[PDB]
Structure formats: C-alpha cells, structure tokens
C-alpha cells in the first residue's frame, strides 16, 4: 500500500499508530513553544513552524538564503538546515513531540466502555486514579521467591509483632508504675476522693490509649503483612503510606508504580492469549451477566488478538504534530495575525514537557514531578479532545479551544463538512424570470453573466482569431468589453449545456441541463414548463448556474440531465412538464363547447340550408377571422390530415387509419380541431374538453407510446397555444364577478336559531361546556357546507373565479367559499375550534375580532410550513444515508420468489371492479409468474412490463392475484438486479444496469413530505421508517380462536381463547381511547379472530407483527401503511420506491447462538452472510448459529454498516473510529458515499466498470471512407 497518491486504492485500512510509527513519520522533534519571531516574522528555530522541521515558506529557498533556485533541489543547506523544496510540503510533513513521561490516549480511556479498563479488566475510576496519579498499582511480584522467603518473612513478621507486644508491655508497665505512684501519693495525703479517682482515671485513660494505640500498631503490622501476602498485579493501593511502609519492608519482591508508566508496564507483562482462552472458557461454561460481561471483554480482546496490532500503542510515547499549514498563522491588513487555536494547545504540551524534563534532570520531590506529569496528561487529553475530561479548556471570552477531535466530530468537523459539499468555480447565481418564448431545451442567460462564466473559452477563441496576441490582451479585451466579444461568446456558447439549480434540491429533477442563449438584461430567462419540477415560482426566487467542462461531463449533462429527457417523474412516471395555470386555462377556454355560439351548426334545413359545415379547417379559420365563427361553436368540418377516433376510422375503412389520405367529417368545435392540430398525426382525434386530468392522461399516453422528442415538441406547442388562448380567454377578476348567494342570510339565520337553542340549552345547564362546543362545531360545519352548496348552485360556469377551479388550473372550491359566502370555523392556537364562526366573506370584509380569530390559524400554518420543510430535509437525510448502497448491478437475479399483488379484486355481482391503487402497485413490474386463465390460454408471459394493455388483458381475463417480481425478493446480493426492479419510472423502459435506485427512491419518498398536512402525519411516517413503537399501539392477535372481549376500568381487559392447543392469551393495558375493530361488521365477543388480526382499530407495532406474521407480511404491512399516508394527501408514490427501503431494513437477522463459528448473543448480522458462514461450517463442525430475522430502524440500520468511513458522517465520530482502529477495519471504498469523499469515480451509472472501460474506435469500413 502506497501513499504516493496515484488515484487508485480500492482499500483503506485504518488502525492504531504505534509510537514507532509516530517517530517514523516525523521530520525531527519540535522542541520549543516559539511560533514566529515578533520582529522578523520568520519561523523560529525548532519551534512550531520551524522550516528545518517542516519545510520552506519561500519556493525553493533555503532559510539563510544561500541556495535559492531550483537547480539546488532535494538537498539541504548546511548552514540553515532547511531542505530546499516547494512550499506546499509544509502542508504535508508532520513533526513529533518526544515525551519524558508516557501518556495514555484519551480515546481509549474516556470511552464507553473504556477499552483500557476492558483490556485490563479494571474500573474506569481505577484509571482515573492511576493516570491522574491518585493510586499505586503493582505490575509484578516474584512469588517464586516470595513463598520460600515468605516462610522467613512470616518469622520476621511474628518477631516484629512480638517487638510491638514488648513495646506495649513496657509501656503498660510504665503506666502501671505511674498509676501505683499516683495511688501511693494520693492515699497518704488527704483530699477529695473523687479527685483521686479522677487521677486514677487519667492514668487509666493513658494506659488504655497506650494499649489500643499499640494494638492498632500491631493491626497495621499484620495488615501490611497480609497485604504482602495479598500482593499481586492489578492491585490498587490507595493512601500510599501503606505503600511507603511496604516499599522498605521487603521492597525487592514487588514492582509498584503509579501512572502511564504503570499502565505501559501492565500492558507489557500481558499475555493477551491467556485471558483470551480464559474468556473463551467463561463464555462457554458461565452463567448470567458474568458470561455477557466476559463476552463484551472478549470482543475487544479478540479484536486486539485478531489484527497485527498491539496494545502497546494504547499508551503514547511520542505525540505527532499536524503540519503547520493546516494550523496556519496568517497575518492580515495592518499585521493582524490570526492563529488557529491548536498552537496554544501545542504550546501548553511543549511547555509542560520541557518543564517536566527540566524537573526530572534537576531532581525534585515526587509530588512536584507527579503533578507536572498529571498536568502534561491533562494537556494532551485536552489537545486531542478539549472537554472530554473535566472542564473544557477555554480562552478569551471563555470560548473553548477547538481541539483536534473538534475537527472531526460535530457539524464543523471534517466528515460532516466534507459531506456537506464545497463551493465550486465556474458557477454563478441570479434571480429568474419567465421565458415564455424559449424552447424546452433552452434557458436564457444574461450576457454580463455568461461572459463571466465562459471567460476561458472566450479567451481561447478570440486569441485563436486575430483579436489578441496573447491571453493577456484577450483578458483585458474581456474586462474592457470590446463589442466583438459577444460574437465570440455566441461561438463558444453554441452547443454547450449548463446546469440549473434551484434552492433546496428536493429531488432529482431539481438539477437540469439546458442549452443557453444570450438574453439582454440581468435575469435568467427560464422556460415556464420546468417551474413545476423545480418548484420555483417567480416571486423573487433565485437559481444558481453551474457549468460542465470535460467532454465526459458535457456528455453527462447533454444526454442525461437534459430538460427534454426528463419529463416523466422518478416517483410515479407521470409527466411533470404537463402544463398548468395559464396554459391549462387557455386550453380549457379553447376546448370548451358553448351551445348557441356564433356560427353554430344547426341541422335546420327548410328553405335555407344547414350552414354549419366546412370543407377545411383553414376555411373555418378564415370564417373565424371574419366575425362569424366563435371557436367554441359546434360545427361539422371535414378533416383530411387527422386521425379520426377509433370507431369512425374502423367503420369508415379497413383498419388502415391512413390519416394522410383520410377524408372524413366530425361534428366538433373549431377549437378542438385546432387543439388536435398540436398533437401528432399518428395520434387519434380527442374530441373532449381539456380538463387537467384529461391533459395528464393525454401526455401519459404520448410518453408511453411515442419517443420523448415528440413528447417534448408536443408539450412545447401546447404551451404556446395555451398562452395564446390564455390571453383571449378574458379570465379577469372583478368585484362584481364575486357574487354572494342571495339566500345566505336566511341560512345563517336558521343556523343561528339552532345555535341559539344550543346556547340556551347550555345556559340551562342541561349539558356541559365541551359538549355545547361540539354542538356548535357540528352546527356551524353543517352550516358552512350548506353555504358551499348554495354557492355551487348559484354560480354559472362562465364566472372566471369558478372557471379557474373548474378547469383544474388551481384552487379548491373552499377558496371560493371563503371569497364569497362564509369563512367558516377558524382554529385555536392549540388546534381546537373557535365556537364563534366567521360569518362574513372576504368579499364582504371581515370585522376586527374575526380578523383576530383568523390570525391564529394563519400564523400556525406558516410555522407548520417552516417546521415541515426542516423535518422533510431531515427525513431525506436519513433515507439517503440508509439506501445509498442499493444500485442495479445485474440483469436478472432469476429467482421465482416474488410478491403477489391484488390487482382489482372483484364485486359480488360478478364485476372485476378496478382497485384504485393499481397504478402505484401493479404497474411497471416484471412478472415472475406466467399469467394463465384456468390453464386455458397463457395470456401474459413471464416478464412483461405490466403496463396498461396487459393490465386490461388480465382484467378481461378476470384473474387478479399475480405473483410479480419485486425488490423485496431479489436474489442478487450486491444491490438488486434489474428485472426484480422492474420498469424505471423515469424512462418507461427497463432500468439500466447502473442506476442508483436507492437515491431515486429516497428522494421520491422524502420530496412531497412538505405537502403532507400532518396519531397521523409526517411524524407518524417518520417513526414508521424508524421502527418506533406507536403511541396509539393497537394490539393484535397472536393465534386464531374466539375472543374473550371484556372491558375493564378505564382500560379494557380483552382475552382470547386459543383455537389450538395453547394458552389463553391475556391482553392487559387496553386504554379507553382504543375501539373495537370493525371488519368483514363490528367486533363482538366470541368473534373468531385470525392469527395476527388487530385487536383494536389503530396503529399496530411493526416489531411484534414481524414476530407474529413473519417477514413477508411485515413488508406488506410497512409498504401499504406508509403508502396509505401519501394516498391521503393525493400523492402518487409508486410502491417500489418504498420497497427499496424496506429491503434495506431487513438486511440483517439477529443471532443468539455462537453455534460453532464465532458469534454473540443478540448480534445483528446480515442474513446472506449468516447464510454464507453456515455453508462453510455445516461441514467441519455443523453447529449453525440460531438466527432470527429482525427489523431494525433507519438511524440504527444506517449506523450498523461495514464501511466505517460512511459511518463516520453519522454520529459521534469518536466512537465510530476508536473501535475502527481497534478492529483495524479496512474500508473497501465500494459504496458510493465514500468515493464521493475521496473524490473517486462513484460506482453508480457512468462510473461502473462495465461502462467506464468502453473502447471506442470507428468501423474499419469507415476508416476506408477517408
């Protein structure tokens, strides 16, 4: 493995760095806390910027300035000591700090669990008392000497205890003689007898003090002797005076130290294999939490045993220095220097090490030396991670110093920021405006901006032409803007696509590519049909513009991300370039038919003829240009260049719908004729009224039948005709054009009488306050609906306010109801309903209290919108971070395992009634089973696309259940295959073999979450992927049988009689907010239940319904429930975008048995890898691990990946990494997340090896052509 940076690794092995490797990397021990000399501003000698250590700051310049040119290269100036090279190796070369006393890394010490204490089986507080110098610890004891000497030492211990006994005997005899003297001098002299007894009591206190004091001396003697017996390594010796009296008394027989040197010695005399086999035996034969604790220790013990690492590097002997350009000291205007906050930590460590070395070479009391070592230890710990232990080291303003771990963890860390994305050159941004004359593959561009974008291209072109004799003349021509430069700009712009980009990119259509064209002004003219995809209205929104440079990048933007190539959804395959408001209203006015219009065909032929027929639509056009024909009048033209609809064509001639040579009549409008002139010749006639749904169906049929270029040109022509008839439609808004219903006031009068009766009923006290609130809520909701019905019948259709909605351009009817009629009921700030309705329309003008009532709901809606777009960003973050490693990798996994789809379950009258969610579930999938009708004709073969006509065919055949293939059962391992993914929604053809459908699925799920209108809503969706427990946890059955339905006290107690041999399953906490599930009729007692039928109607948990109904149904439970939410908002998400995620969740099963090959209880490992090890272990020791499939949540399944580099961008990056270097887990760079970070060609789409390695060379016929 070479670090010479040749841009191919395919491997990245993190691991612990030894002290030998640290001193191997460096270029000399930095040994002074001097950064930059205050006067000369040159780096100091042997300090934190020393050019001899790291390198020169001036290019190929030695420090003294003797050698100064590139001829002197690769050498070192003998005077100044700086190797001559470039300045950018100062970014590269590390230095190290040698240490006088050893050091423990805080990343193995302050962890959960502390890996030091788990390797040495010690408490965390043991370590905080050892390497903070609060306790002693022995590392060895010569028991081979200690027993055969311990005989004689017991003899000497008994001798010395006899000596303390002789001392207390002589002391008590002296006190006995003193007490005898006190008695003999008290008896013969007359005083108070109590004073003599108290003199005896003082002597007695003295002799009891002597006897228990020398008793405790003897106790301390036998205590230090017993400690010498119980003298062993890994023993903590607190209070250290026992230690000091144990050093001199037989000091040779043990080795007790304190600190990092003691930890290093303990790791030194540590056969890891001994405790490895001991822990093997304990996890084999043990019981309880001692077994699981030995498992948790055995994890890291076998981790250290497995790789070629050693725990010697857990202590630290030399500390490396990050190269000084990464911690620069730049001065500013006025000489304002700017440090980088690591230099202070490095200065503190350097100073403390120098002081410690000085005190060690001097000779000092050990309190001072150990205190300096503790200060050094805290300094190193804060240098790696400030605030990991104790109080964080801060500076001026008490702001904490951004230490080394702070450059990795957190939002400002290297991983998150490098994942966040960088600013780019050849870019730019502007505000946008509409481009209603541009073609679809086109965007306007201001010449003042596109001149700034294409400056190198325009310089090269106008220096190739004679307008500049070098690039400098061309550059000053660009800045001074000679008028030929616009011509040169047009030359370099022609066929050179740019990228457009709105603010936040919710999904894949948020970045498109357009051919530019120069436009006067300063705003990006943008085609109006892509604002739906961008979600960019023209209220002042700004779009950024990037630019591809390479031939590969220009080809990628030209073929892949072109505007006309992306019309259909990634989500549901519906066209997103389908027209809207102005275009839809114009086409609606153009295609509606009004009876009695001018120039109408009448069949009246008495004396006069019928006068409604036209030989040509051009003749009709002249008849409309003259003031005779209204374009919405019924006429009978004879069309010759249009395909008649299928009935008239097939009945008119022999199925050869030859619309070039057709000649046929149609009783239509002129407008629908002119409208169907936009459509292709191969398309049949339409003869309908262009509702927006009808136009959606038309463009769907066009996209699924014709090539996309015809769809693009048709959509462009539709836009132009839509605007041209949007002008002539006359849809204005007048204050007279908002009519209020004349019977509004009587409606409000009658419902006010009902409300007054309810108010009187509450005023009697006949009902509670909440119930009269509910009564008024029901009364005014019914009143508002009645007002809406009266307004619906009152309005005529030519009213432009109702015409906009009735076309389907925009808006619901409720906006018209709030315009004229009644506002209705406005919510509380809490979300309750205000009992006073707003009985005035916005046309009539509100009153002040009504406006104050409406402001609550307005403010809450805006706050909800802000929180909803933030949470949707988070949800898409989680989904992309889970599903980013599912790309199509094989053409066909070729299993037969596939799910079954319902596909239009019938009616009891005999009708195969169409299920609503066919176009989201059964569409666009490859059939795994052949379709047969009672084994009659095989109607649809295995592996059809399941588009429209085969669905109609199976509907005619009557068969419903179709076992279709899906990604829930794709037999490929590395990602999914192609046929199990089915038809791509973006193309309508089969998915190509490199399309990252995980990111497509994640974006299509996370995108429309802002339109999700909020237990149910977006948090309910968010916990659903997260595999959380639902708060409204409706219970499920566990077995069939008749229920013992019973309702207790504030919560129900519903039991179930098992139909099988089993126990009567008790369900305990069934609160009153849950209700009996009505299915099939309402639930009843003794109703025979299913295996996993839901007890109450509500939210079932996914984890137990996995544990009951197996893994198949828990996919069908997850998919349909999540899709049920997006049904409620009218959002078409095809289920295969959901099914990508659910396959990612169930990748892992749980493991309880070790079996025969190295497993742990509760270990979550991959199903296929669990399957993989078992095949190699059923032979040679056939004891497999006891496995169980488990559902794991999104934020958890993301973190339990093998690629630690991808996992580093997720959470607390220390614990992602400290185990990773312990396990020496080499990343393989195979996910596309990591190849982004190292800038490798990502393996998805163009980067994969089947496409990247294409040899391109012309045909040998073509070489003979020239």
């Amino acid at each position: 493995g070479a670090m010479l940076d040749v841009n191919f690794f395919d491997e990245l092995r993190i691991g612990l760095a030894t002290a030998e490797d640290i001193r191997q990397w460096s270029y000399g021990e930095v040994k002074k806390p001097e950064t930059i000399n205050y006067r000369t501003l040159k780096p100091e000698k042997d300090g934190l910027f020393c050019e001899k250590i790291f390198g020169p700051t001036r290019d190929w310049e030695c420090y003294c300035g003797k050698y100064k040119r590139v001829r002197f290269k690769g050498i070192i100036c003998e005077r100044c000591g700086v190797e001559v090279t470039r300045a950018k190796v100062r970014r590269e070369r590390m230095g190290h700090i040698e240490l006088a006393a050893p050091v423990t890394h805080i990343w193995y010490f302050k962890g959960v669990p502390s890996r030091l204490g788990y390797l040495l089986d010690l408490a965390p507080k043991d370590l905080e008392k050892i390497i903070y110098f609060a306790a002693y610890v022995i590392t060895s004891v010569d028991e081979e000497m200690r027993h055969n000497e311990l005989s004689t030492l017991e003899a000497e211990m008994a001798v010395e205890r006899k000596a303390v006994e002789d001392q207390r005997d002589g002391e008590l005899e002296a006190r006995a003689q003193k007490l005898e003297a006190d008695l003999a001098e008290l008896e013969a002299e007359g005083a108070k007898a109590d004073a003599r007894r108290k003199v005896r009591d003082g002597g007695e206190r003295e002799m009891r003090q002597i006897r228990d004091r020398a008793q405790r001396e003897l106790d301390r003697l036998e205590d230090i002797w017993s400690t010498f017996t119980k003298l062993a390594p890994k023993q903590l010796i607190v209070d250290e005076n026992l230690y000091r009296e144990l050093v001199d008394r037989y000091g040779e027989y043990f080795t007790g130290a304190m600190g990092a040197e003691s930890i290093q010695k303990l790791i030194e005399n540590f056969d890891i294999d001994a405790e490895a086999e001991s822990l093997r035996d304990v996890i084999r034969n043990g019981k309880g939490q001692k077994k699981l604790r030995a498992l948790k220790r055995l994890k890291v013990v076998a981790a250290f045993q497995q790789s070629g690492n050693s725990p010697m590097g857990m202590v630290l002997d030399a500390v490396p220095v990050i190269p000084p350009e990464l911690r620069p000291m730049v001065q500013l205007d006025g000489g304002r220097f700017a440090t980088s906050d690591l230099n202070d930590l490095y200065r503190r460590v350097i100073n403390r090490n120098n002081r410690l070395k000085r005190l060690i070479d001097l000779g000092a009391p050990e309190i001072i030396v150990n205190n300096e070592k503790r200060m050094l230890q805290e300094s190193v710990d804060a240098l790696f991670d400030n605030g990991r232990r104790g109080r964080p080291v801060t500076g001026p303003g008490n702001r904490p110093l951004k230490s080394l771990s702070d450059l990795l963890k957190g939002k400002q860390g290297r991983f998150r920021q490098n994942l966040l994305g960088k600013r780019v050159d050849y870019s730019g941004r502007s505000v946008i405006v509409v481009g209603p004359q541009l073609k679809l593959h086109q965007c306007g561009l201001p010449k003042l901006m596109a001149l700034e974008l294409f400056k190198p291209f325009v310089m090269k072109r106008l220096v190739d032409l004679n307008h500049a004799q070098n690039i400098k003349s061309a550059k000053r021509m660009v800045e001074r803007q000679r008028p030929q430069v616009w011509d040169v700009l047009e030359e370099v712009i022609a066929e050179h696509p740019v990228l457009l980009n709105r603010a936040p990119t919710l999904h894949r259509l948020g970045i498109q590519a357009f051919e530019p064209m120069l436009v006067e002004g300063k705003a990006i003219q943008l085609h109006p049909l892509v604002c739906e995809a961008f979600n960019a209205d023209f209220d002042g929104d700004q779009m950024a513009v990037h630019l591809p440079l390479s031939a590969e990048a220009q080809a990628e933007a030209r073929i892949l991300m072109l505007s006309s190539n992306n019309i259909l959804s990634p989500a549901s395959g519906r066209p997103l370039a389908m027209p809207r408001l102005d275009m839809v209203t114009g086409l609606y006015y153009l295609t509606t038919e009004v009876p009695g219009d001018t120039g109408e065909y009448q069949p009246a032929s008495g004396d006069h003829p019928e006068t409604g027929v036209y030989s040509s639509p051009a003749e009709a056009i002249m008849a409309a240009d003259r003031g005779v024909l209204s374009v919405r009048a019924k006429i009978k033209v004879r069309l010759t260049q249009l395909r008649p609809p299928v009935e008239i064509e097939a009945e008119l001639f022999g199925h050869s719908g030859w619309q070039p040579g057709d000649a046929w009549m149609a009783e239509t409008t002129l407008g629908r004729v002119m409208f169907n002139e936009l459509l292709p010749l191969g398309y049949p006639f339409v003869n309908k009224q262009m509702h927006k749904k009808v136009q959606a169906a038309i463009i769907n049929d066009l996209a699924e039948r014709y090539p996309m270029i015809v769809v693009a040109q048709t959509v462009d022509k539709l836009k132009d005709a839509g605007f041209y008839w949007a002008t002539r439609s006359g849809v204005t808004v007048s204050m007279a054009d908002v009519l209020v219903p004349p019977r509004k006031k009587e409606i409000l009068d009658h419902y006010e009488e009902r409300a007054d009766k309810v108010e009187k009923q509450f005023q009697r006290g006949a009902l509670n306050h909440d119930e009269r609130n509910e009564a008024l809520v029901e009364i005014w909701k019914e009143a508002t609906d009645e007002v809406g019905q009266a307004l619906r019948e009152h309005y005529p259709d030519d009213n432009p306010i109702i015409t906009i909605v009735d076309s389907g351009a925009t808006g619901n009817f409720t906006q018209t109801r709030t315009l004229a009629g009644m506002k209705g009921l406005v919510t509380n700030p809490k979300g309750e309903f205000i009992p006073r309705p707003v009985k005035s329309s916005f046309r009539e003008g509100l009153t002040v209290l009504e406006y104050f009532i409406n402001t609550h709901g307005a403010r809450k809606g805006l706050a909800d919108t802000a929180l909803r777009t933030a949470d949707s960003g988070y949800l898409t973050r989680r989904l992309v971070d889970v599903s980013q490693d599912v790309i199509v990798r094989e053409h066909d996994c070729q299993t037969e395992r596939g799910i079954v789809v319902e596909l239009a379950e019938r009616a009891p009258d005999g009708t195969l009634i169409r299920d609503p969610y066919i176009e989201t579930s059964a569409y666009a999938r490859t059939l795994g089973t052949d379709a047969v009708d009672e084994a009659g004709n095989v109607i649809v073969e295995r592996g059809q696309d399941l588009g429209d006509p085969e669905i109609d065919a199976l509907l005619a055949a009557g068969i419903t259940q179709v076992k279709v293939r899906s990604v829930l059962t794709c037999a490929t391992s590395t990602g999914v295959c192609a046929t199990c993914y089915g038809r791509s929604m973006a193309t309508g053809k089969l998915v190509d073999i490199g399309e990252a459908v995980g990111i497509v699925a994640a974006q299509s799920i996370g995108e429309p979450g802002t339109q999700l209108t909020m237990t149910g809503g977006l948090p309910r969706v968010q916990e659903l992927f997260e595999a959380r427990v639902p708060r409204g946890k409706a219970p499920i059955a566990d077995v069939t049988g008749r229920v013992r339905l019973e309702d207790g006290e504030r919560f129900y107690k519903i039991t179930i009689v098992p139909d099988d041999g089993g126990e009567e399953v008790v369900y305990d906490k069934i609160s009153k907010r849950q209700r009996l599930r009505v299915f099939k009729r309402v639930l009843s007692d003794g109703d025979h239940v299913e295996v996993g039928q839901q007890l109450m109607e509500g939210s079932a948990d996914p984890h137990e319904v996995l544990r009951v109904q197996g893994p198949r149904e828990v996919q069908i439970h997850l998919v349909r429930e999540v899709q049920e939410v997006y049904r409620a908002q009218g959002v078409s998400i095809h289920d295969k975008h959901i099914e990508v995620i659910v396959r990612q969740m169930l990748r892992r099963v749980t493991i309880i048995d070790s079996g025969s090959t190295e497993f742990l209880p509760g270990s979550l490992i991959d199903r296929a890898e669990f399957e993989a090890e078992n095949r190699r272990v059923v032979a040679e020791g056939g004891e497999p691990a006891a496995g169980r499939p488990v559902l794991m949540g999104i934020t958890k399944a993301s973190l339990a990946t093998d690629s630690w580099l991808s996992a580093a961008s997720f959470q607390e990056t220390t614990r992602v990494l400290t185990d990773a270097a312990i396990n020496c887990r080499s990343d393989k760079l195979n996910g596309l997340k990591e190849n982004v970070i190292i800038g490798k060609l990502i393996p998805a789409g163009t980067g994969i090896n089947r496409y990247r390695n294409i040899a391109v060379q012309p045909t040998e016929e073509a070489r003979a052509a020239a």
């Binding site: 001193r23 460096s26 270029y27 000399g28 021990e29 040994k31 501003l41 040159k42 020169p56 700051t57 001036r58 290019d59 190929w60 310049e61 050698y67 590139v70 001829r71 002197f72 290269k73 690769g74 050498i75 070192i76 100036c77 003998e78 000591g81 190797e83 300045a87 190290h96 040698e98 350009e325 620069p328 000291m329 730049v330 001065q331 500013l332 205007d333 700017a338």
Partner: protein
C-alpha cells in the same frame, strides 16, 4: 469589505526539472543510539561532522572525523551556590557537628 490574508512566504511558478539539478553529495550520519541518517548536502558544501538529525537528537557523521568533544561548561551546582556564601572551614565545622550528631545517634 472582504478581509484578505497572506501566509508570509514566497510563491514562485517554475518548471520542476527532475533532470537539470545541482549535483550533490550524500553524508551518512550516525546518532547516539546508532541510528543511520543520510542528509543530502550539496556538492560544493562543507559537511559538518555533527548534525541535528531527523531523530530529534544530535547525530554525528558516520566516519571517524573526530568532531570537537565538548566545548562547553557546567551551568552551576548547589555546591557552587553554597560556596558563594559559606566557608570551607564553615562547612567542615558543620560536618564535624553532624558527625557528633550521628555519634549521639549511634553510640552516645
């Protein structure tokens, strides 16, 4: 408006010729713990026999060129600090008084 900075160093822009260089000697250096180090000096260059190597210590030249051994002096001792204020006979009388003190400790 925009605050700018400059790391105080010179940046040129030349051709990295890996062919047309000043030719050069290589001096092998041996440190105190036998560590080898090959410092590239120039051709026209006096080679110092002593050299602070990459090791973080002083590394002498691998040949027996005999550099200067010390050329230094001891800083000071606690005895020197003692001798600046006291007499030799003063310290000898204190030595005899502590000899008599250890005599009273031992056998008196």
């Amino acid at each position: 408006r925009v605050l700018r900075g400059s790391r105080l160093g010179a940046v040129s822009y030349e051709t990295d010729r890996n062919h047309d260089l000043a030719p050069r000697q290589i001096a092998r250096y041996r440190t105190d713990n036998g560590e080898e180090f090959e410092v590239p000096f120039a051709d026209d260059a006096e080679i110092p026999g002593t050299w602070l190597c990459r090791n973080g210590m002083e590394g002498t030249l691998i040949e027996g060129d005999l550099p200067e051994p010390k050329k230094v002096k001891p800083p000071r001792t606690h005895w020197d600090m003692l001798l600046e204020r006291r007499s030799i006979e003063e310290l000898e009388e204190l030595l005899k008084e502590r000899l008599e003190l250890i005599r009273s400790r031992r056998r008196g």
